[PDB]
Structure formats: C-alpha cells, structure tokens
Amino acid sequence: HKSEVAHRFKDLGEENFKALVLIAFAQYLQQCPFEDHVKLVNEVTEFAKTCVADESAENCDKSLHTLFGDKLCTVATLRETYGEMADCCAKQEPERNECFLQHKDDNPNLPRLVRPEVDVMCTAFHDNEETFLKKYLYEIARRHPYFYAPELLFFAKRYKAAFTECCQAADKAACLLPKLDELRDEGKASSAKQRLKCASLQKFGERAFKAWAVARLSQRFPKAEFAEVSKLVTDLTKVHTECCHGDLLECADDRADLAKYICENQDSISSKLKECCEKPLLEKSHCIAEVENDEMPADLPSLAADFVESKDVCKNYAEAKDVFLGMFLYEYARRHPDYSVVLLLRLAKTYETTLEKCCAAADPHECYAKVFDEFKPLVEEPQNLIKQNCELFEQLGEYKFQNALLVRYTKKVPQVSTPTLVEVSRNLGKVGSKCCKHPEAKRMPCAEDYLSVVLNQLCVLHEKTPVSDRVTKCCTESLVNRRPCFSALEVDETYVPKEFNAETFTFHADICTLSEKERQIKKQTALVELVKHKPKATKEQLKAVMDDFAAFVEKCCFAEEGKKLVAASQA
Ligand SMILES: CO/N=C(\C(=O)N[C@@H]1C(=O)N2C(C(=O)O)=C(CSc3nc(=O)c(=O)[nH]n3C)CS[C@H]12)c1csc(N)n1
Ligand SMILES: CCCCCCCCCCCCCC(=O)O
Ligand SMILES: CCCCCCCCCCCCCC(=O)O
Known part of the structure; x- marks a missing residue:
C-alpha cells in the first residue's frame, strides 16, 4: 500500500495498534522503563493518525521496518544502555533489523515479578485500567522478546475479564487467585513451548518438524486430503521458521495469510472452523491453532x-x-x-x-x-502407563500421588538434587490431575503436551548442572525416545546411601504457620532425603515413617519428640 502504517492502523484499530506497538518496542528495548515506552507509543500512534488522514504525508510511504528502525535509533540512551545495538543504526534497513534481532536477549536478568495483594490490584485496576493492562504487556514482552505479540494481547484481555469479575465479588481473593495462577501458568507454558519448538527446529532439522506437522494436522483435519494437509504443512513450516527468527512483521503476515487460506477452504479442511473464521483478523490464527479435532469420515478402510x-x-x-x-x-x-x-x-x-x-x-x-x-x-506402552498412573492417582490424592512419584524417582535416580526432584515430581503430579480427568480419547495427547514441557525444564537445569549420567543420556536422545527412556529408568542398585544428617531431618514449629504449599514442599524435601538415606527401605516401612510424621507434626503444634522419631525410624 501507499502508507503501510496507515493500513495497519485501520485494520487493527487504535487500541490494538497501541498495544502491539508497546510490545514491539518492549521486546527490543528491554531495559527502558515503562514511562519511556508509553511516550514512544503515543508518538508512533500520533504519527500513524497523520498517515490515516493523508497517506501522502511525510514519511508515511516508508516501510514499517524503516519507521520502526528509525524510531529505535532515536532513543538517547541507546548507546549507553544497549551498546552494540547502537552500532546497528549505522546499517541500511535490510541489515539494520537483522542486527537488531541478533541483540534480542532471550534470557534477560530481570527480577521476578511479585504478585501484589488482591486489594492493591483491584484498586489499581479501577484507578487506571489502561496502564494496568499495559504494564502487564510491558513486563512480559521485555522478558520474552520472541513471544507472539497478538497472543500477548489475548492474555491481557483475559486478565481484564478476571479483574472485572472478581473485584466485584464477595470474596475477591477466592475468585481472582485461581484465575491468576491459571493465566500465569498458561503464559509461562506458552513461551516455554515456543522456545522448545524453535530449538528443536534448528537441531533436528526441517524434516522432523514436517513429520510432526503432518501427524498433528492430520489429527486436526482428518477429512482433508493428503494434498491439502501437505500444503498446510509446507505453509506451517514456513510460518514457524520465520516466527522463530524474531521478525514480528514477517511472522504475523505469514500467520495472517495462512489463516486467510484456511478460512477460504473450510470445505477442504475442517468443519469446526466456523467460529474461528468469524472472529476478527487479529484472533484468526490463534483461534485456528487451538481448534477442536474434526470427526473422521468413519468410512476409512484399513x-x-x-x-x-x-x-x-x-x-x-x-x-x-x-x-x-x-x-x-x-x-x-x-x-x-x-x-x-x-x-x-x-x-x-x-x-x-x-x-x-x-x-x-x-x-x-x-x-x-x-x-x-x-x-x-x-x-x-503409553496406554498401560496412563492406566497404571491414573489408577494410582485415583486411589491417592494429588499430594499423595506426588509423594508416590517422589519415592519412585528418588530410588531410580538419587543423584539429582533434592529441590529438582521435588519440583519435577510436583509438576508431574499436576499432569496426572489434569489429564486423568479427561476421557481416554484425550488422555495421551494431554499427557504429551504437559510432559514435554516438564521433561525439558528438568534438563534445562540438568544441562547447566549435570549430576546424573542416565538423565543426560536420554535428554540427548531423540525427541520421540525422550519420554520412553524416562519411563524405562530403573532403580540405581549401585548407589551408596547418603550420610545421615541430623540437621536435614530436624524440624521446627515454624512450619505450622507456613502456607500449605510451603508445608508440603518442606515435607516433600525431607521425604527425598529419607529415600537417599535408605533406598532399600520397603514401602511398608516408609509408610510407617510418614504416618508417624503426620502425627508428630499434629502433636507438636518439639525437638524432644523429634529425637524419638528419628531413632525409631532409623531402626
Ligand atoms: C505487571 O505487574 N504488576 C501488577 C500486576 O498486575 N501483576 C499481576 C500478577 O500478580 N501477575 C502475574 C501472576 O499471576 O503472578 C504475572 C505472572 S505471568 C508471567 N510471569 C513471568 O515471570 C514470565 O516469565 N511469564 N509470565 C507469563 C504477571 S503480572 C500479573 C500490579 C498490579 S497492582 C501493582 N502495584 N502492580
Ligand atoms: C508431505 C510431508 C512429508 C514430511 C516428511 C514425513 C517423513 C516421516 C518420517 C517418519 C519418521 C520421522 C522420525 C523423526 O523425524 O523424528
Ligand atoms: C501456532 C503457530 C501457527 C499459527 C497458525 C495456525 C494455522 C493452523 C494450525 C492448525 C493447528 C496446528 C496446531 C499444532 O500443530 O500444534
């Protein structure tokens, strides 16, 4: 078009335009404060309005990359804060933006976001609702420079619905906190799934990605012919290749063209696409990517x-x-x-x-x-694992199932650090609580999605600090053989038990006031150290020690009764 920035403003709308521009600048200038980015958004938005009024106005004919790159190079603190990124400004636009993409920090050193009190959030959400949601976009974008910006808008609008409903309920905390934990976990999982899929595309090659795309698309669109699925796989591979590169403009236009084609050929693809294709342009590709499985023709031969x-x-x-x-x-x-x-x-x-x-x-x-x-x-093999684990999950609870996994994985690989064994077993327990509720038709696909992000984060820290030869041997294995090996791990019989530390098993009354999550993690930490100290302890002997711990914690809410609990359990 004559004025590309004017065309974007008319298609997206003023609100979505400003939100997407905030994300774009926050992903490149991750260290600049929130107030500086608000000023840049208002300047870009006010310039875009001059192009909408007259596409022949000055600089309105420039490309989006040129306009964005020129605006990125007007920041006065660019040389002092980002250094080598200021040297990008001495290049032409084809090389300048590529120089900008090379300096995106995928792992910035920013402090952890602390959740404020519920009353503080609701008051802040009421006083200035716009800056409230924009602060969220700013903080997440600067921490994930490759996060798909429209998907970030999708989460921001869910926070708005969460605060709108819960800040007017009788119990705000009971309403809002479960929704915030849900939005937090789905946001962290979304960026984690993107990082893993992008890294696997570069290592295992494009062929393995197309084989994955063929399988998933054929499950999604079973009524489509093989020529149609193969055409979608080619376009989907091109989309992921560029979205993994970092260029937000090429990534979004590719997804827009793919969703446009899918919506124009629904009769040749799927029947479940009626709802997604009636949604605005900004929400098409995101909606289609999570559309329900269509029914199979049922007349399929062997x-x-x-x-x-x-x-x-x-x-x-x-x-x-x-x-x-x-x-x-x-x-x-x-x-x-x-x-x-x-x-x-x-x-x-x-x-x-x-x-x-x-x-x-x-x-x-x-x-x-x-x-x-x-x-x-x-x-x-995976069907019997689902039935075996969901049956054990049904007999116990989530917490008891987590403790059951702790003893299993500590006996199999005790070399792993104790906080890692606790964190992984707790996440694996949440996988069972989420997927075992689904019917058998969705149990195995559910488990695959959650297990893939948990087994990767287990080795995201194990690759930085190796301690087990069996764990790192199967995280360097093929992606299809990663999970089957972790299930095939056995108990390390050649493991000398760790020395008995009295301070490790020593407990104090401060755990009685802690939250339930804190008391569980503390109790689960000592359970791993008990298995590391006595891996040959039977399940009946271990249950007797755990039953005496729950009774001793209830009676002591000190150190005198704890000395008898240690000596009795050591026999
Ligand atoms: C921008 O934050 N500032 C807020 C605010 O709204 N906070 C909310 C809160 O409790 N939030 C939650 C979460 O649920 O943990 C989160 C966690 S989501 C997340 N965190 C990460 O570290 C990461 O890498 N990815 N993701 C997706 C984000 S802000 C929001 C605020 C409100 S009043 C005030 N003074 N500050
Ligand atoms: C029409 C698109 C065809 C894409 C290529 C399909 C190749 C199937 C290979 C099956 C085994 C692959 C295993 C793997 O890559 O990890
Ligand atoms: C999510 C990145 C691609 C965005 C565009 C989606 C186009 C249709 C995808 C169909 C569903 C595929 C989901 C998947 O492969 O995991």
Missing part, C-alpha cells in the same frame, strides 16, 4: 491394503520415500486422534525402518507382511 498387502509398496516407496511415509503418517494420524504425536512418529519410524530392510531383502512382501504387529507393543 491401512494394510495400501501399505502392507499391495505389490507396489516398495515401488511407491522408492519413488518418494518421505511422501510415502508422509502418506502413511497422514492415514495413521487421521484414524487415531487418541494417540500422541510422538507415538504416531514412533510407528512411522518403525514402518520406515521395516521398508528399508524389507525392500532390499529376498522376498519383500513376506518381510513386511507382519509390520503392523510391531506397532501393537509401541501403542500399549
């Missing part, structure tokens, strides 16, 4: 005809292996939306290995004739 019993299995495979394997993934994924994506990739890799061996053997047809039998043990 896969043995095209992939097992046909005489041209090796011929069609030799013509284009990834296309043939992609068609195998497409057909298997559209028929099993209850499987996890990594499970479908597990079956595709098995079918790929089989064809490589069989198509070169003497009798290929007889060789891969029983390939589907290899898929059954691979499918039963």
Whole structure:
C-alpha cells in the first residue's frame, strides 16, 4: 500500500495498534522503563493518525521496518544502555533489523515479578485500567522478546475479564487467585513451548518438524486430503521458521495469510472452523491453532491394503520415500486422534525402518507382511502407563500421588538434587490431575503436551548442572525416545546411601504457620532425603515413617519428640 502504517492502523484499530506497538518496542528495548515506552507509543500512534488522514504525508510511504528502525535509533540512551545495538543504526534497513534481532536477549536478568495483594490490584485496576493492562504487556514482552505479540494481547484481555469479575465479588481473593495462577501458568507454558519448538527446529532439522506437522494436522483435519494437509504443512513450516527468527512483521503476515487460506477452504479442511473464521483478523490464527479435532469420515478402510498387502509398496516407496511415509503418517494420524504425536512418529519410524530392510531383502512382501504387529507393543506402552498412573492417582490424592512419584524417582535416580526432584515430581503430579480427568480419547495427547514441557525444564537445569549420567543420556536422545527412556529408568542398585544428617531431618514449629504449599514442599524435601538415606527401605516401612510424621507434626503444634522419631525410624 501507499502508507503501510496507515493500513495497519485501520485494520487493527487504535487500541490494538497501541498495544502491539508497546510490545514491539518492549521486546527490543528491554531495559527502558515503562514511562519511556508509553511516550514512544503515543508518538508512533500520533504519527500513524497523520498517515490515516493523508497517506501522502511525510514519511508515511516508508516501510514499517524503516519507521520502526528509525524510531529505535532515536532513543538517547541507546548507546549507553544497549551498546552494540547502537552500532546497528549505522546499517541500511535490510541489515539494520537483522542486527537488531541478533541483540534480542532471550534470557534477560530481570527480577521476578511479585504478585501484589488482591486489594492493591483491584484498586489499581479501577484507578487506571489502561496502564494496568499495559504494564502487564510491558513486563512480559521485555522478558520474552520472541513471544507472539497478538497472543500477548489475548492474555491481557483475559486478565481484564478476571479483574472485572472478581473485584466485584464477595470474596475477591477466592475468585481472582485461581484465575491468576491459571493465566500465569498458561503464559509461562506458552513461551516455554515456543522456545522448545524453535530449538528443536534448528537441531533436528526441517524434516522432523514436517513429520510432526503432518501427524498433528492430520489429527486436526482428518477429512482433508493428503494434498491439502501437505500444503498446510509446507505453509506451517514456513510460518514457524520465520516466527522463530524474531521478525514480528514477517511472522504475523505469514500467520495472517495462512489463516486467510484456511478460512477460504473450510470445505477442504475442517468443519469446526466456523467460529474461528468469524472472529476478527487479529484472533484468526490463534483461534485456528487451538481448534477442536474434526470427526473422521468413519468410512476409512484399513491401512494394510495400501501399505502392507499391495505389490507396489516398495515401488511407491522408492519413488518418494518421505511422501510415502508422509502418506502413511497422514492415514495413521487421521484414524487415531487418541494417540500422541510422538507415538504416531514412533510407528512411522518403525514402518520406515521395516521398508528399508524389507525392500532390499529376498522376498519383500513376506518381510513386511507382519509390520503392523510391531506397532501393537509401541501403542500399549503409553496406554498401560496412563492406566497404571491414573489408577494410582485415583486411589491417592494429588499430594499423595506426588509423594508416590517422589519415592519412585528418588530410588531410580538419587543423584539429582533434592529441590529438582521435588519440583519435577510436583509438576508431574499436576499432569496426572489434569489429564486423568479427561476421557481416554484425550488422555495421551494431554499427557504429551504437559510432559514435554516438564521433561525439558528438568534438563534445562540438568544441562547447566549435570549430576546424573542416565538423565543426560536420554535428554540427548531423540525427541520421540525422550519420554520412553524416562519411563524405562530403573532403580540405581549401585548407589551408596547418603550420610545421615541430623540437621536435614530436624524440624521446627515454624512450619505450622507456613502456607500449605510451603508445608508440603518442606515435607516433600525431607521425604527425598529419607529415600537417599535408605533406598532399600520397603514401602511398608516408609509408610510407617510418614504416618508417624503426620502425627508428630499434629502433636507438636518439639525437638524432644523429634529425637524419638528419628531413632525409631532409623531402626
Ligand atoms: C505487571 O505487574 N504488576 C501488577 C500486576 O498486575 N501483576 C499481576 C500478577 O500478580 N501477575 C502475574 C501472576 O499471576 O503472578 C504475572 C505472572 S505471568 C508471567 N510471569 C513471568 O515471570 C514470565 O516469565 N511469564 N509470565 C507469563 C504477571 S503480572 C500479573 C500490579 C498490579 S497492582 C501493582 N502495584 N502492580
Ligand atoms: C508431505 C510431508 C512429508 C514430511 C516428511 C514425513 C517423513 C516421516 C518420517 C517418519 C519418521 C520421522 C522420525 C523423526 O523425524 O523424528
Ligand atoms: C501456532 C503457530 C501457527 C499459527 C497458525 C495456525 C494455522 C493452523 C494450525 C492448525 C493447528 C496446528 C496446531 C499444532 O500443530 O500444534
């Protein structure tokens, strides 16, 4: 268009425009205070209004990158605060913005955000609602420079709904705190899923990402033909490649073009896209990315005809292996939306290995004739883990299930630090409470999403501080074999028990006033140290020690009765 900034202002609207501009500047100038960014937003917005009134006005014909880069280089504190980022200003726009992207700090050293009191938040939300929501956008954008800015607007509007409803209820804290914990966890999980998917795209290559996209899209859109799914996978791969690069402009236009195409070909893709495609342009791609699974045609034949019993299995495979394997993934994924994506990739890799061996053997047809039998043990393994863990979760509670996982994982790998074993087991316990409530149709896909972000953060700290050879051996393994190995870990019999420290098991009455979360973490910390001290302790012996601890904590609310509890448990 003649004035691109005017076109953006008319499409997004003034409110969304200012919010997106605040996020854009906060992701590049992460160290500048909130008041400086509010001034920059008002200046860009006032300039955009001159272009809407007259697209032929001065500088209105410049590109968004030029206008943004020129405005980024007008900051007086650019040389002193960001240093090498000021050297980017001596380059032309094609190289200047790339120089800006290279200086985005994915891990800035900013202090933790502290949740204010409920009465303070509600008062602040009432006094100045706009700056309240803008402060949220500023703090999260500067801490996550690659966070998709429209998705950040999606969270900000949910905070507005949370404070609007809860600050007028009879009990504000009971209403607001569960919603804030939900928005906090989903926000941290969103940025964590983006970082993992971007890092996996650079390491494992584009082929592995397309294989993942084929499986997930075929589950999402089972009524679509393979040519349609393959066209969506190509566009989706291009979208993620650029969104991972950091250029917000190219990322958003790609997602806009993809959502526009999907909404224009609903009859060839899915029937569940009626609601998402009626939403505004800013919310299309985000909505489609979380659309519900469509129903399968139900008239789908078996896969043995095209992939097992046909005489041209090796011929069609030799013509284009990834296309043939992609068609195998497409057909298997559209028929099993209850499987996890990594499970479908597990079956595709098995079918790929089989064809490589069989198509070169003497009798290929007889060789891969029983390939589907290899898929059954691979499918039963996660299914039996879901039933085994959800049944154990049903007998116990969330806290008791977390303590059950603590003893299991401490015996298997006691070399891991105690706060890590506690934090991981608590998160794995929340995975069980969230996914075991779903029916079996959504249990395995639910577990995959939450386990992928928990197993990665377990090794996000273990890669910086290695302490176990078995843990780091399977976080360097393939992505489809990461979870199966963690389930295949065994008890370390060659582990000498840790020395008994009296100060470790020593407890004081200060834990009786602490919150429930604090008393649990303190009790769960001592449970790991007990297993590290006596890994050969039976489940019956361990329960007797835990039952005496719950009774001693109730009676002591000191050190005299604690000495008898240590000596009795040490026998
Ligand atoms: C910007 O914050 N300032 C606020 C305010 O609104 N705080 C809210 C509160 O308690 N919040 C929560 C959360 O739920 O923890 C959070 C946590 S969400 C989050 N935190 C991270 O560190 C991160 O990396 N990613 N994500 C997604 C953010 S602000 C909001 C405020 C209100 S009155 C006042 N004086 N300050
Ligand atoms: C039409 C798009 C085809 C995309 C390529 C599909 C290749 C399937 C390979 C299956 C095994 C992959 C395992 C892995 O990459 O981790
Ligand atoms: C979320 C990044 C892509 C945004 C555009 C979405 C286009 C349709 C995606 C369909 C759902 C895919 C979800 C997934 O692959 O995990």
